[model samples]
Target chain A: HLTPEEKSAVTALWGKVNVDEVGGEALGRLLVVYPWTQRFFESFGDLSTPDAVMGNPKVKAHGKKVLGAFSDGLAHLDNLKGTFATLSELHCDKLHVDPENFRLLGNVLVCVLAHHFGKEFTPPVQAAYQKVVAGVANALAHK
Target chain B: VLSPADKTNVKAAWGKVGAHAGEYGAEALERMFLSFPTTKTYFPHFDLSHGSAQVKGHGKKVADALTNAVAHVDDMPNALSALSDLHAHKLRVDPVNFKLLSHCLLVTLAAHLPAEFTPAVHASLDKFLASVSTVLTSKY
Candidate 1:
């Protein structure tokens, strides 16, 4: 439940976020810091080391997809559950992913945003982003 | 730096969360690990299963640290100076995870203590946790 101000802040900031750049950084950090998460992407190729994983084309492609989903979440802020329904089922039922991973990725994305945006990513903006991520994670957690 | 009302609200909420702080702490860590498995990177030696006894033990330590913060809200920097040194020197984690753990702790508190975690209390607790986080990560 984002306030109008929160929503405005998010939309305003998101307008400047480069999907591939930020998304790749976020995904790379996720894989590097949470190495176990890489298990889910065994098919992504050359993930033996952090450097390899960071440089992998497949990783970049998938990062775009992951952040693309985030953008879609932003677009469907009002209907998150419905928008993420299929992805949720796919992750839970087919992929057998612990839905909590969604929270991990969301937070990582937030960290990336903070790193890139710096001062512009104020506390209120971060809180708003946290709410959005929580909503997105909840939607992804639907089983 | 907490305002006067923030300090009062935090103390009041912690009073209700009193002896059972360990339980909530365990639940918070469990939620963090489940939700953000990367946090488990720090506790590589322990069993991180759903109901790990080791997690419970460590959770108690976390609760003790937070309880100490509650007691020393007015002087957090000095109160947690030793912990800040330990965290910066020994643990040396990325600071971002502090926010992640704080977020999980808040969620756990809300889930278990809905009656006590009103909007005002929630805001107070958020500020308290953020303040504590600042002190803990300051040495880095």
Candidate 2:
């Protein structure tokens, strides 16, 4: 029941986001916990090293790419089904992306936003993202 | 030239095609890039390689913009203003490329939603998309 203004508010915070700090640091947390997502990439014998992730420019850029997509995607939350379906099929068919991986990413992003937005991340904002991220995770599920 | 139901059909069909926006948008951009190399100028950072994140991401973005615009048809001019600025002012995207992308959007939609995509739906969507494309070129 969000008006267009409210929906647009969802992404306005990301106008000049520090993807390196937010996306990169959060990805650092995500890969540290999941461990498996790291292996999905090219060779990294034991990518558990903190520097291996946070210091790597490519990983940093990948982090930003992801944030860019999520930021753009969130603006279109009203059409989540259709918008997210693209990434779902990308991970499912073209790439061997697992649904859990997407979920983990969403989880970390919540953590990231909470960390970045802090007190500003109120119940409504948190709740809205929870629903939207859940929808993304569900759509990306393996059938 | 559409019944009220045709508008609903138009929106729904867009959703169906939009679900595959990464694929469709990529194909459209790919063609535009290959045919009109200048379009690639604005997209310097994009991967453009088939199935790459840049391609997929832009595809999703285009679909979202279009779908959001369609969803708010009453706010068509306002809905498209920001996008028009991004292209014409900031990105300096060629106006013809908007038409190019629309053509590909229709191609993708026609393939994906043949059943709901009757002649009336096509007519309605065509008019709407053309207007969208034209509006997007305003700042240029």
Candidate 3:
């Protein structure tokens, strides 16, 4: 619960976030890539490519491992107090080069992880993924 | 699962909930204070209790508005649009804060209705919260 004064201050702080000014283009692209990548993986399935199946639970526990790595990687970024410029540079050099590849890899990894953990794992995993995607979009937009 | 009569009953329940806003408003205001302690600092110019009363009165007004507005929930977009405009322009409440308030509301509801709060009721409340969140997050 916020006092009226604190509420006013927080409200003012949020006013600076400017949601309309952020990520419009990146989100539009996400709308395209999200479905496109989904279709790509549907076509690829288990037999799609060597790297595609790398994260598969039957083949290996690559998805969970990589997601852990990704989580750690993002945490490391946070530890650095990294700005949008640093993230932007990294995205351009790494993330943007094969966005679809990473995207599909991530989905496969998460799906396998979900299967492994069952219902207990779904919500937090989904929330984490949502946060990551939102963070990435925010970084890219500001970049 | 709800029939037309059930829907009417739900709307009436919501109205009842809203009508008691003046009575409940102080609690709501207090809840806000508890959640964000810093929010209390801004009330130096106004009487906190009076402000809470005003908020309660406003809640009743909103309840009345919702009772009328939700009658057209089948055509929800327009009704929601009006709400969006109010929050975005008039109130300037952040969508994320709306979500935080919802969490608070759920907690309050659970505390208030401890006996009757079943899993089904919880699920229903969650769906309502999600719907409200979606509307709050929707683009104008």
Candidate 4:
């Protein structure tokens, strides 16, 4: 459970995030750093390298959707497990993914926040971010 | 398939990792990501950054799952029956990654518990992990 201060910290930071840009960046990084991840995005096309991944329009569009999920998590902190149940089913039950992917994307989103908000992303803020992301990932992992 | 001595070694090592299971599991995952990059394909949505809290949390779950496995070593198929179906039917994780994860766990233990990780213990751990892997992948 996040303390009030922690939640405040996260909320204040999240208010500034542009889901379109940040989401695309985070997903692009995941694909580039972990190149094998592209197998899931075969339809995205030509994710052969870092440049191609970043430039791909499909990556940007999907990144928006991915970031939107995080926004949903932020909005429904109390009902996380229930909120993400359908998503969990989609990823874990239907997509044949381990729940770990939620944790992965969550962390990547944190890194993106840190990159964009270096000064505002204080240590305390980071701790709050971790808690929130961990919570979201845990909820996503729920079968 | 663990012999009596193998069980002893596995338990002893687990004792050393009592509270640090999550840390060890996290390290093992980090090692796997670095050493076998392709194994990370299954986790395209994750941060994959150094010392990520997300990985640490997942590692904690991994450790807890393994701890339960240790608790029921002899009855792993039944103990992990639900998990086996999850991976085989729901997750559909590639079985090859199981060996990669097991190898990383072995390396993580040896790297941290040098004095306790004796040659005999290593062999026993290897067999033990292999056994667990077999159970996890049996459904596949």
What lDDT does each candidate get? Answer: 0.80, 0.69, 0.46, 0.84
Top model by TM-score, which number? Answer: 4
Candidate 3 colliding pairs, count? 13
lDDT of 4 by residue, A64-98 (tens): 98878888988999999998889888876566554
lDDT of 3 at A72: 46
lDDT of 3 at B45: 55
What's the TM for model 1? 0.55
Tens digits of per-residue lDDT for model 2 on A88-113? 77776665554666777888888888
Q: Which candidate would rank higher by lDDT, 1 or 2?
A: 1
Docking quality of model 4: it rates as incorrect
lDDT of 3 by residue, A103-136 (tens): 5444443444344445644464455644444444
Model 1: pairs clashing at backbone N, Cα or C within 3 Å: none
Judged by whole-model lDDT over C-alpha atoms, candidate 1 comes out at 0.80
lDDT of 4: 0.84
Query: Per-residue lDDT for A18-131 in model 1, tens only?
Result: 877778867876786556888988888787765787788888888888888999999999999999999999999999888778887887677667656755765467668877
- Where is model 2 more than 4 Å wrong at Cα? A1-9, A43-46, B1-140
Kindly report which residue stretches of model 1 are placed more than 4 angstroms away from their true locations once superposed.
Answer: B1-140
CAPRI quality of model 2 = incorrect
lDDT over C-alpha atoms for residue B127 of model 4: 96
- Whichever of 1 and 2 has more DockQ, that candidate is 1
List where candidate 4 sits over 4 angstroms from the true fold.
B1-96, B100-140
DockQ of each: 0.04, 0.01, 0.01, 0.04
